[PDB]
Design a protein around this ligand. Sequence first.
Ligand SMILES: COC1=C(OC)C(=O)C(C/C=C(\C)CC/C=C(\C)CC/C=C(\C)CC/C=C(\C)CCC=C(C)C)=C(C)C1=O
Lengths: 76, 387, 54, 105, 64, 65, 134, 104, 286, 157
Amino acid sequence: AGMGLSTGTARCYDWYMDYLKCMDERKEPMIALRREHCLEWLEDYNECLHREKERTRRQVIERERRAQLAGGSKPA
Amino acid sequence: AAAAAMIELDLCFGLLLLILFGLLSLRNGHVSLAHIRFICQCWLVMITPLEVQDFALCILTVVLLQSFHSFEALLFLLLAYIGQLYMMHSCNLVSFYVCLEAQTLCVVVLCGLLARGASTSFSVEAALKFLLLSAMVSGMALFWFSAMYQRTGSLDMVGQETFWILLVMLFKLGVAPMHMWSVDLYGSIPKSLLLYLSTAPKLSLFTFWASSWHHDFSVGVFILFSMFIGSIGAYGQPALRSLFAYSTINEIGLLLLAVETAGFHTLYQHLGIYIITQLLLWNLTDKRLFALCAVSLAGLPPFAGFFGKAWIFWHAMSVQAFSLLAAALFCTLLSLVYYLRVIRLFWTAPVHTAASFTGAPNQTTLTSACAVALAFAPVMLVKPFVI
Amino acid sequence: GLIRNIATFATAVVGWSVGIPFVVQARMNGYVERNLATYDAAQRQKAEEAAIGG
Amino acid sequence: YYTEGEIFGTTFMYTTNMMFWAGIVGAVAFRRNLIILLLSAETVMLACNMNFLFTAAYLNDITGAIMSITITTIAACETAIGLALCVAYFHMRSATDVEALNMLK
Amino acid sequence: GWNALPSLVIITGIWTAGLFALDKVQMFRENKPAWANNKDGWQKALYRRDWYLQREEETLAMAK
Amino acid sequence: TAGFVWREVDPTGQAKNRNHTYMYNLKTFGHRSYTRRDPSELQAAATSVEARVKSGELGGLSPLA
Amino acid sequence: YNAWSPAQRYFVEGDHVVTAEASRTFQFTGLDSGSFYPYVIATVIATAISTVFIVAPLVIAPSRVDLDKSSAYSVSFYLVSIMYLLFDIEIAYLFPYAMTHASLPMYWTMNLFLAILVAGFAYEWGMGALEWRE
Amino acid sequence: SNTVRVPYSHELYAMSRHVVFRAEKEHKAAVECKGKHDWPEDCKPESEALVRATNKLYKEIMEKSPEEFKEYAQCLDWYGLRFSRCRDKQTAFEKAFPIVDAKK
Amino acid sequence: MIVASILILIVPVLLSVAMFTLAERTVMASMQRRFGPQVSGISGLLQPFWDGLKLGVKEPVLPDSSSAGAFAASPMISFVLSQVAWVGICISDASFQGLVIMAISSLAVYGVMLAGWASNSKYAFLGCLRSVALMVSYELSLGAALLSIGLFVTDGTGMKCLNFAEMPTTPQYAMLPLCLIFLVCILAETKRDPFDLPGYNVEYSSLGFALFFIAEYANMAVMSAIASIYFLGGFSALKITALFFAFVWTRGTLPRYRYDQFMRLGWKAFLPLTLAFFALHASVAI
Amino acid sequence: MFFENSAILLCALLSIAVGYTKSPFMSLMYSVMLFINSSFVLMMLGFEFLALVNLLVYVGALAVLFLFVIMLLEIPATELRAYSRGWSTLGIFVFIINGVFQITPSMGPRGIITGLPGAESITNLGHALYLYFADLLILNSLVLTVALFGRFAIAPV
Ligand SMILES: COC1=C(OC)C(=O)C(C/C=C(\C)CC/C=C(\C)CC/C=C(\C)CC/C=C(\C)CCC=C(C)C)=C(C)C1=O
């Protein structure tokens, strides 16, 4: 259920295990209360999964590159 | 080491031996199979773990097997029981899907197989409609499981996609407005499968819900739909099969009110009383006891149905679910009218009960007379018992 | 006729193979635009919280 | 703004979403027979199977392949039973219905 | 009989000449007599690395 | 198992309730963890590698010319 | 298909690699191992050949119109088709077993799988369902 | 940027017996570093040492026995890195260039 | 280069199909103490070519009561599948090559069933179902035989596959009964003697009919090459000729089964035997 | 990558085409084309064996059963109100809203994903099926047993 398709484990299995270890070591009587204290590991696991923030950074660099070529077309 | 899995190996070995024994018995031309049924009941007891819900399902299925006579029907009921048992232990959507689909296929095939007389084509028609409606709900379950699996990367049942899985579960309980497959099934399929369909899968699915399910949503509109639609439909439908189908929709609305306000103890108490009443309802030969089912399904005070409704009402009032409670009380006032119609039909009438001619003389008087003693269970129900 | 049906199928396949990528491209462009708006709003909130949070 | 792999992935997901809703709705919308309804149910199963295999490749994970095999098994069993029931109902009701396998007429 | 011998000889000769020609053509395409072997993920990774590094060696050669 | 769970009560009471998915994955697949190297070790190893390059017992970064 | 990223090209920079990949020859020992691409070309070429076979006698052959030339000169199949469906699924299940170097518990699990198969098959044999008298 | 590469796959397979018998310490250090640290920046010196130790060995073989190594690596290239089809070339190359320094 | 390799493959396939159908006539004649085709060209060596050219200038009969598209599509589908299966034999390096060819040969059922649906004959509909039932029944024994074969196929790196270049180059003496079952399964797939009772191409004339027979003989050659790869230690010209001679030899000397007779044979003899051999070989392979 | 993306997008066209046509035979032909094309799509993701399973089961086995049932049970009634009654505009509106505009997509808030090819290992699949998911394998066998017994019991006599 966490077994890899061509490798031993999945590519983001260890990030998931970090998150579950954080959830294991908290002592709050509710899962919803424990989740508020492990949000950094859940965020890193989601970044392993889909890379939304790396894609966002590349989109911002592309917006600046498209801005420095339309507004700026300076000839020598 | 596989030493912790001897019950699974025992399940498989027992199925392998039972098929061969059933083959050998049929090569002799035996027109009855009570020995096969006893071996099936032994196999049911031998594969069930030592929990309360597991043994409740086991004893229920042992009692149900006395109304089935062919070898193939017994095999289909055993393989439906495997899905019903292992759904209570399912902690993913993989096993959830497989157990639900095994149960659906077994029910469809049994609806096709057991019909007789002029009602054969009606039963096959209603089985086809049920299969087509079940296929798209199974597709919805698979599609949103694939969505959840892609989003989370794991097999955890969290997030927005659990709303559609919840709708899948509500379909399997016949919750209005997705209720009409059960209404179609009640009108044509014979009484033994109707008895099977109203008891065992509801227990299995509610135990899965109690054991391994959380959602961040509500089911209140389906509570309102089930209670109002079931009560008004049973008030308006003159055929008795449709009366009992709509009254079942009303009862599943009450069970959903028990689920929605938490407090699963009232859910389990009402479900147990309902299952015993169902076991009485579909095995009746004397029609005077049809009035006892009526007074105990209307919630009238000294009988056990009152207690099953009244802890649901008590826990709903405890957590202040006022609007759903008011709707439940209005529909309870409406339900009394058609249960009184039942009492008018079958109690204030001359008594006629035909004798048996080809043996088997009134063959389920033991179970029906035992289940009528739901007038003596209320002494244990008033105590803190089901928690 | 057979020639009409083969021509209609070929037309439908080519039209589907040219028209749907424009739908997908427009949808992806809308998602990129909304994501960039979300990034700018997050940067604005971060600057505000740095301003009154020390 | 986006790469060729992102076009390929978004095209796959858009295709499977339209496939799923085509299989769910279309044969009912066009008022077709029970046989075509079972074929469209197979289209629904194919869309889910493609989604699971895409995700199994996307995560480098085995669970999508297990689900793929299971989906193929369950879909074929349900389809075979449904076709047998269709044939039985047609032979039971053709003397008075003619269009017996069409319940959407 | 003797009448059946020419067709049976011709089938063998046709398949011999065709397999020889197909072998020479595919050997010219692949340049190694093990192109039809089974390849796992490690062998596929090795071939793809070899191809890309050969392209890099060609790119660096046309700069001196 | 990979899709089923069974719950039994400890007779002695000396068992702690944890997430069974986390426990199952710890026994089945394990959990790999790493650490960042201390920077002083990095510059020490880089200095040693540079000395081995300069003294002549290390080769080049490419087999080509 | 061509690689669209520097990581997919083993971090080789330049424009020679992009044009060299886009205009490469197909090679099972280059970038196209286990590729299944010749199966599509074979379908296209054979469909072309069979279409030329279909069309050609509409040109180079005699033809005469006649109304008589354009005229016509069980449940066991259900059993066969459905049984073949189930047995084909079972063989597809058995194929990942045979492609592994299986240990003993894998062997006993596979034999339990086969035993359930052959038990259902032997039940249908004993009830006289493989006697094709009808 | 500098071009970093190791020899081709058939050459790597042809020289793989000398790597553990002549560059064992670089191999050990690289394995231990990759076990401890996941970031590629944290294992740069050991990675560089292993690459340079492989390339130095490749430069040694081409100075001592180039033709035997070339025919053995060509044989491994021809037969899809199957060692069982080039035993004679392997024997000739190991005779020309011993795996461990003999008679020392 | 792929298009060139495929055309260079296609040329001897069609030349060989013409020479197979001539050699079948002449060997069948020699067993019956006659000559067979000798007049048409020197030693009769032009007879298949004149049959093909005669069918080329033959009138195409298109019945104006059938569906023209499926009627045209059925022999095209048969021919295309035969050519694709040959390409899978010779121009592939796939890991599951035998599974690929089994999948292709499972698709070959469609030409028979499209011919049965298209043409408006009473007994074409009756015979197509019988032929499909025969092919469908023996495909399972072919698959279980492939399961038994694949238990011992490992490449150099240790991976188990169905790649043809990794098969051993010695005859498989341990699987002689499975080889015999495989050969009779090949006879059943090609609808030859003793399973030739079902025909489906009763309404086809000229080059559609020619496409049907080219597909049938090419499929026979595919199965012969597959059997020679699996059991005879390799693919060769001599082995193709010897197995074809064996098939014609069996066609010369035997009568055919009834429909229910070969159905009982395939469902009560060949399938349990192949499954039992698979279980025994799995026990050996541990 | 024009032909690969076109082959991906063709599956949705064939999915609509299955229900669009009035001929049941043509519906089955569209389904066979769809399953062949999808088997080639799955092999873009790196799956060789599972694409072959798709072909072998759905096209090889199940569609033969579909064609036998259609050819045994369908006297031509395409004129008999299959053309004369048309279709449902409400159902077409539901299809447009949910599958063209896709107001409730499976990716949810995300709108772009990077498609990544895999590398199928059948050793990993064999290990998983016969060690880690063995109970699911046996329960799949039990479902197939239900199918076999249930069909043979429901066969019309
Ligand atoms: C008892 O069994 C038999 C039958 O019953 C099943 C038969 O029906 C037939 C008769 C049918 C035949 C021969 C048709 C099938 C074969 C064909 C069409 C031959 C294919 C050959 C090809 C494509 C190559 C020929 C073409 C060339 C050389 C190109 C020429 C071009 C130029 C000159 C420019 C035979 C012989 C037979 O034994």
